[PDB]
């Protein structure tokens, strides 16, 4: 399964199976036991703008 969204860089370590914070507590939820992989990369060149 593939779920996709964009977050900030200073909060990606809120994403681990068993965590805290408003993207772990609210807005999304992992289980505690986990199989898959998580991949993230900055897109400030394209997704940020003046």
């Amino acid at each position, epitope marked *: 399964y593939a779920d996709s969204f964009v977050i900030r860089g*200073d909060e990606v370590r809120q994403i681990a199976p068993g965590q*805290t*914070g*408003k993207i772990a*507590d*609210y807005n999304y939820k992992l289980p505690d036991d986990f199989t898959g992989c998580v991949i993230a990369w900055n897109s400030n060149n394209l997704d940020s703008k003046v």
Partner: antibody
Amino acid sequence: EVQLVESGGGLIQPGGSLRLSCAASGFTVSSNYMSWVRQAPGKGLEWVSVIYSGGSTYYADSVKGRFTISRDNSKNTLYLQMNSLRAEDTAVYYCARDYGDFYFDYWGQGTLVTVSS
Amino acid sequence: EIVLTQSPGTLSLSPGERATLSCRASQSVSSSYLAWYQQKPGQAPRLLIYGASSRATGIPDRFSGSGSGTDFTLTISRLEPEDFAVYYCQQYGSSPRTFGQGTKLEIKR
């Protein structure tokens, strides 16, 4: 929206433990964040701890492993249980209603935490 | 680094004139994620303005905060004498919420 009375603090010898209480009124105390902030009597304002409406808590690094917050939304009473008291945690403390961005918009009255001496 | 540092630290003036002050960080902050506070001595400290843009209710409009990044100011358009207190800057951009040390506002009778 009249709320946030504080009580409980005072003279206490070091090494003890104390649960403070900040009761509010006219507000759904469950469905928001609250916080704690200290005020050293010669110095500025320093944040202590936060709770979430879901219920997650965070603390300052100095008070790590020492201080436990809790609440009873059946009686609308925040509980700051501080333990292993040292003689530099001698500030006056404030319960603070919290919004959103973690602005502390509504403020308590204050109560003195004074270490044994 | 995130440390709020007041510009002057105190101001002694005469009422009826435009008051202006700033608070300086120790790095550039993410955009306008800071606030101001005032403290009445012997009382509870109170809200001043969120986001350095607009202030909340219960506050009149004689006051204006501006700036971006390291510098971030606050301007009171006319000195009300009863507003003499200790005034704080507060941030919420960084992962802790750090504070400053305050600014004293008074008059020289």
